[PDB]
Amino acid sequence: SLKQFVNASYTDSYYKGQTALHIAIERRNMTLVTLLVENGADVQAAANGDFFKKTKGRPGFYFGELPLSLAACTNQLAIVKFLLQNSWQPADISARDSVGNTVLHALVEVADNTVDNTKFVTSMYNEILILGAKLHPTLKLEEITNRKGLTPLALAASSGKIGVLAYILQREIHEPECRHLSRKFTEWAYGPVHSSLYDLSCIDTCEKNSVLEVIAYSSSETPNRHDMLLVEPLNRLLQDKWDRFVKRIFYFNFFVYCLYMIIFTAAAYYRPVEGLPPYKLKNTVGDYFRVTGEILSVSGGVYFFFRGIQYFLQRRPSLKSLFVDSYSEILFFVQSLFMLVSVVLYFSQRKEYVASMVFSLAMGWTNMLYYTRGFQQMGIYAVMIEKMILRDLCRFMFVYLVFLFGFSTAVVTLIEDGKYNSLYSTCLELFKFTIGMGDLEFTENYDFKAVFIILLLAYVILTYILLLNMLIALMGETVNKIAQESKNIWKLQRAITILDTEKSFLKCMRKAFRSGKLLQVGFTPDGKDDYRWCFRVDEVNWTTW
């Protein structure tokens, strides 16, 4: 018999499942593929050895484990067609591998955002969609989810495969019996004007993996998470959501936080100065206002505390993403923690509550910069402030603090039995040089004045003259390189705010669902008519009449 021979395959755990059809396809030999299919080769044999998995720490090549997926992922269209529509054994276009990935999931997986790869991956994706429509008109390949529950579109969005996503979202197929596979349609075109319609299925909303939620709440390791919202329908859609629905709510939130911070500031400004809290409420108007303000301040502290916990439990960052991303959540949460510790110290009969309260108060005002998102220029400015802090200020502060401490220890060692003669005082006195207040003769309690002045001049030349001017130069270099990166980060921040407001929404309103339900083609594979919640975009072109 021949069927056992032709379908012989590796049994070791490394090349497990590989059979002669895999080798024939890998070698790009059409004749061997045709012959093996003629003799009863199993076109569904799953190559699931360790070599055929992702396995970042070892060499390998994942392609979806099936001969059809191998042919597709190697840019061999002829073999794909032959496997799908041969006489002896056609391949199952909807088949899934051990991960649950179909051929389209595999094509998304092998994408890596280079130009040639993007070209061939999108071309093969389109060809497979056309063939699936011709062979299984009732089958909806793109709705099949892998074992993680991701469709090919959601997988593309979560994986950062911007080329494939950009292809999918504005896909337009001009031929009969494949029009319904489009996601971009041209509705009317009069002169140079024409009004296109983008699908918005699984973009604005869906069961689990909306494209916007996937991109916005990505795990900060995604390659292109800032860039993916520049894909045409998504940027226009977010602007539409903002203008129509979210702008007013966000302004309201900003106003409320401003009122809270004013009330907190007023309450803290008029704190009583007698010892030993808590303090008896006097029967006068001012003190009633004061205690009301204290209650409101603590209420806001509890509010932000619990919202911070809700953020943590809902997102569950993995303890590194917890710190390198979502700085605003950390800052507001820490503000609330200072407020609560201040409450505890207040009712613990300790004066240290003042030390806690002011810290929260200071953070509260700086956290007002959170609301600079939602205004274009201030939003970009705040993003640039963030990046300057994270890169240039941090590197400078490491070097500067090393130099400061080193020269402070040298100088305080030289000083003997003086007013300063302590690491704190000399550290502060050398720090004053940084703010342009350095005395340069702040003490004489030493021997060897020449040593003292040599140390101070060296410190000034190294920190004041070199390092600060160098910091200005480096920030000038940075700001030149983060313009577009700043725009994309601000757009992502506003997208996050949009999604959060729409998920909160406070009124059970359904108007958040934009774009309107239009009959798109009216001719699915069957006689039914297709309504798709499309988004309209008018364009003007003075070529291609």
Ligand X SMILES: CCCCCCCCCCCCC(=O)O[C@@H](COC(=O)CCC)COP(=O)(O)O[C@H]1[C@H](O)[C@@H](O)[C@@H](O)[C@@H](O)[C@@H]1O
Ligand Y SMILES: CCCCCCCCCCCCCCCC(=O)O[C@H](COC(=O)CCCCCC)COP(=O)(O)OCCN
Q: List residues near ligand X by CB under 6 A.
A: 220, 325-328, 331, 362-363, 366-367, 369-370, 386, 389-390, 458, 462, 489, 492-493, 496
Residues 229-258: x/- map of binding to its own copies (CB under 8 A)? xx-xx-xxxx--------------------
Residue 436 among known ligand-binding residues = yes
> Within 10 Å of residue 504's Cβ, how many Cβ atoms?
10
Tell me whether residue 192 or residue 278 sits nearer to its own copies (CB atom): 192
Residues 487-526: x/- map of binding to its own copies (CB under 8 A)? xxxxxxxxxxxxx-------------xxx--x-xx-xxx-
- State the binding partner of 192 from ligand X, ligand Y, its own copies, none, CB within 5 to 8 A by kind: its own copies
Q: What residues from 34 to 63 belong to the interface with its own copies (CB under 8 A)?
A: 59-61, 63
- State the binding partner of 327 from ligand Y, ligand X, its own copies, none, CB within 5 to 8 A by kind: ligand X
d(CA 3, CA 22): 16
Please report the sign of the dihedral spanned by the C-alpha atoms of residue 220, residue 223, residue 226, residue 228: negative
d(CA 375, CA 383): 12
Determine if 78 is a binding residue for ligand Y (CB under 6 A): no
Residue nearest to ligand Y (CB): 424
d(CA 51, CA 415): 68
Tell me whether residue 23 or residue 340 sits nearer to its own copies (CB atom): 23
Tell me whether residue 252 or residue 448 sits nearer to ligand Y (CB atom): 448
Q: In what order do the strands lie in the sheet with 535-540?
A: 184-189, 193-198, 535-540
| Three-class DSSP labels, 64-102 | CCCHHHHHHHCCCHHHHHHHHCCCCCCCCCCCCCCCCCC
d(CA 257, CA 251): 10
Determine if 180 is a binding residue for its own copies (CB under 8 A): yes
Tell me whether residue 390 or residue 453 sits nearer to ligand Y (CB atom): 453
Render the burial of 432-463: b for 16+ CB within 10 Å, e for the rest: ebeeeebeeebbeebeeeeebeebbeebbebb
- State the binding partner of 540 from ligand Y, ligand X, its own copies, none, CB within 5 to 8 A by kind: its own copies
Tell me whether residue 153 or residue 268 sits nearer to ligand Y (CB atom): 268
Residue 15 among known ligand-binding residues = yes
C-beta separation of 351 from 365 below 8 A: no
- State the binding partner of 331 from its own copies, ligand X, ligand Y, none, CB within 5 to 8 A by kind: ligand X
Residue 17 among known ligand-binding residues = yes
CA distances from 473 to 142, 404, 478 (A): 51, 21, 9
Which of the ranges 215-223, 305-313, 355-363, 421-429 carries the binding residues for ligand Y, by CB under 6 A? 421-429
d(CA 426, CA 414): 11
Residue 478 among known ligand-binding residues = no
Question: Exactly one of 39, 315, 354, 505 binds its own copies (CB under 8 A); which one?
Answer: 354
Tell me whether residue 55 or residue 422 sits nearer to ligand Y (CB atom): 422
d(CA 419, CA 447): 15
Residue 247 among known ligand-binding residues = no
Closest CA to 124 of 92, 86, 89, 79: 79
**Angle, CA 346 vertex, CA 345 and CA 351 arms, to 5°:** 75
Tell me whether residue 303 or residue 431 sits nearer to ligand Y (CB atom): 431
Q: What residues from 78 to 97 belong to the interface with its own copies (CB under 8 A)?
A: none
Q: What residues from 448 to 477 belong to the interface with ligand Y (CB under 6 A)?
A: 449-450, 453-454, 457
Q: What residues from 423 to 442 belong to the interface with ligand Y (CB under 6 A)?
A: 423-425, 427-428, 431
* 220 Cβ neighbours under 8 A, 6+ residues apart: 321, 324, 325
Residues 409-428: x/- map of binding to its own copies (CB under 8 A)? xxxxxx-xx-----x----x
Residues 162-191: x/- map of binding to ligand Y (CB under 6 A)? ------------------------------
> Within 10 Å of residue 280's Cβ, how many Cβ atoms?
8
Amino acid letter, residue 202: C
CA 529 to chain centre: 37
Tokens at 336, concatenated: 């609330």
Please report the sign of the dihedral spanned by the C-alpha atoms of residue 428, residue 433, residue 435, residue 437: positive
- State the minimum distance, in angstroms, from the CB of residue 155 to ligand X: 21
Determine if 451 is a binding residue for its own copies (CB under 8 A): yes
* Residues making up the binding site: 15-18, 26-27, 327-328, 366, 373, 436, 439
Binding site for ligand Y (CB under 6 A): 422-425, 427-428, 431, 449-450, 453-454, 457
